[PDB]
Motif scaffolding. Structure first.
Motif, short mmCIF file in Angstrom:
data_model
loop_
_atom_site.label_atom_id
_atom_site.label_comp_id
_atom_site.label_asym_id
_atom_site.label_seq_id
_atom_site.Cartn_x
_atom_site.Cartn_y
_atom_site.Cartn_z
N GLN B 27 33.88 9.06 5.03
CA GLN B 27 34.18 8.03 4.04
C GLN B 27 33.75 8.49 2.66
N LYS B 28 32.73 9.35 2.62
CA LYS B 28 32.22 9.91 1.37
C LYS B 28 31.66 8.81 0.48
N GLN B 29 31.11 7.79 1.13
CA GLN B 29 30.50 6.67 0.45
C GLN B 29 28.99 6.83 0.45
N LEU B 30 28.37 6.57 -0.68
CA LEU B 30 26.95 6.79 -0.83
C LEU B 30 26.31 5.62 -1.56
N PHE B 31 25.11 5.26 -1.15
CA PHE B 31 24.40 4.14 -1.75
C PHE B 31 23.55 4.62 -2.91
N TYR B 32 23.12 3.68 -3.75
CA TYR B 32 22.20 3.99 -4.83
C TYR B 32 20.85 4.39 -4.24
N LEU B 33 20.45 5.62 -4.51
CA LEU B 33 19.31 6.25 -3.84
C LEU B 33 18.04 5.39 -3.81
N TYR B 84 22.58 15.22 5.20
CA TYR B 84 23.86 15.88 5.36
C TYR B 84 24.15 16.81 4.19
N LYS B 85 25.18 17.63 4.35
CA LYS B 85 25.63 18.52 3.29
C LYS B 85 26.12 17.70 2.09
N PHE B 86 26.46 16.44 2.35
CA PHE B 86 26.93 15.54 1.31
C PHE B 86 25.75 14.90 0.58
N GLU B 87 24.57 14.96 1.19
CA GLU B 87 23.37 14.36 0.61
C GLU B 87 22.61 15.37 -0.24
N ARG B 88 23.16 16.57 -0.35
CA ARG B 88 22.54 17.63 -1.15
C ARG B 88 22.33 17.19 -2.61
N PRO B 89 23.36 16.63 -3.28
CA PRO B 89 23.22 16.15 -4.67
C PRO B 89 22.11 15.11 -4.84
N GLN B 90 21.86 14.31 -3.80
CA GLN B 90 20.77 13.34 -3.86
C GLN B 90 19.43 14.05 -3.90
N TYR B 91 19.27 15.03 -3.02
CA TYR B 91 18.06 15.85 -2.97
C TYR B 91 17.87 16.57 -4.30
N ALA B 92 18.94 17.19 -4.77
CA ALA B 92 18.94 17.92 -6.03
C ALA B 92 18.58 17.01 -7.20
N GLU B 93 19.19 15.84 -7.24
CA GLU B 93 18.99 14.90 -8.34
C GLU B 93 17.54 14.42 -8.38
N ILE B 94 16.99 14.09 -7.21
CA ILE B 94 15.61 13.62 -7.14
C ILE B 94 14.64 14.65 -7.68
N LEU B 154 17.82 -4.59 8.66
CA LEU B 154 17.24 -3.48 7.91
C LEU B 154 18.33 -2.50 7.48
N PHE B 155 19.12 -2.03 8.43
CA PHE B 155 20.18 -1.07 8.14
C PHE B 155 21.39 -1.78 7.55
N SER B 156 21.74 -1.39 6.33
CA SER B 156 22.85 -2.02 5.63
C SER B 156 23.84 -0.96 5.14
N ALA B 157 25.09 -1.08 5.57
CA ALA B 157 26.11 -0.09 5.24
C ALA B 157 27.19 -0.68 4.33
N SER B 158 26.98 -1.92 3.90
CA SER B 158 27.97 -2.60 3.08
C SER B 158 27.86 -2.21 1.61
N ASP B 159 26.63 -2.03 1.13
CA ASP B 159 26.40 -1.72 -0.28
C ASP B 159 26.51 -0.22 -0.53
N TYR B 160 27.60 0.37 -0.07
CA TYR B 160 27.87 1.78 -0.29
C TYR B 160 29.06 1.97 -1.20
N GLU B 161 28.86 2.72 -2.27
CA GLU B 161 29.92 3.02 -3.22
C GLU B 161 30.52 4.38 -2.91
N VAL B 162 31.83 4.51 -3.07
CA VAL B 162 32.47 5.80 -2.89
C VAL B 162 31.98 6.75 -3.97
N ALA B 163 31.29 7.81 -3.56
CA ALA B 163 30.71 8.75 -4.50
C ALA B 163 31.77 9.30 -5.44
N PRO B 164 31.51 9.24 -6.75
CA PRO B 164 32.46 9.68 -7.78
C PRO B 164 32.87 11.15 -7.61
N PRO B 165 34.09 11.50 -8.06
CA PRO B 165 34.65 12.85 -7.90
C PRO B 165 33.76 13.95 -8.48
#
Lengths: 42, 172
Positions: B27-33, B84-94, B154-165
């Protein structure tokens, strides 16, 4: 009179093993999804 | 090793794990970290949960041992394969934006549950004795059931935004 199991060593060992984990990629088991391909076609 | 430790993934959490994987990778959807409920707080929950559910508990030796262990285990392993490989930018950003940000912080439940999935093969590295294994798998399953009992709350998957291009370019 009983000696309970100790988590200290397990965590020591487990973290030491984690130290040997290079940044590969998180993958879920085959039953969950399986994102790995099999060496074949030959 | 002699015994392949089967941590046993809770079948109640499997649909969530499959959805998590799908949501992130497909889905390539990611929440606000920024996670208000971080791993540290989850450990605190679990630790105090034991003493409140029981009456005369004295397993605080192992509870604290587990909390300390999990904290460092999650911390040291964070970045390698706890994302995930998609969570790399989150790690990098932090790291880039907050070099003082603890790896046991900033991330919430999804990453701690991520740990339990990868620890399965990790336990195959560690030749644990029956006593410690049984006791530990007990705590892990207690933890898993604690999470599973709150899978919807606890686990919420609704507040996920499609990560920008452009953000995709920081992952792949």
């Amino acid at each position: 009179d009983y000696v309970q199991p100790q988590l200290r060593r397990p965590f020591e060992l487990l973290i030491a093993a984690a130290m040997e984990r290079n940044p590969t990629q998180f993958q879920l088991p085959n039953e969950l999804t399986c994102t790995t391909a099999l060496p074949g076609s030959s | 090793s002699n015994a392949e430790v089967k941590v046993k993934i809770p079948e109640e959490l499997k649909p969530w794990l499959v959805d998590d994987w799908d949501l992130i990778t497909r889905q390539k959807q990611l929440f606000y970290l920024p996670a208000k409920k971080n791993v540290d707080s989850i450990l605190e929950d679990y630790a105090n949960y034991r003493k409140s559910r029981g009456n005369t508990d004295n397993k605080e030796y192992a509870v604290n041992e587990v909390v300390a262990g999990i904290k460092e285990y999650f911390n040291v392993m964070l970045g390698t394969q706890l994302l995930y490989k998609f969570e790399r930018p989150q790690y990098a950003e932090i790291l880039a934006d907050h070099p003082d940000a603890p790896m046991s912080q900033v991330y919430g439940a999804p990453h701690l549950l991520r740990l339990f999935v990868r620890i399965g093969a990790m336990l195959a590295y560690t030749p644990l004795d029956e006593k410690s294994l049984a006791l530990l798998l007990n705590y892990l399953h207690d933890f898993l059931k604690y999470l599973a009992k709150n899978s919807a709350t606890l686990f919420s998957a609704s507040d996920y935004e499609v990560a920008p291009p452009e953000y995709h370019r920081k992952a792949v």
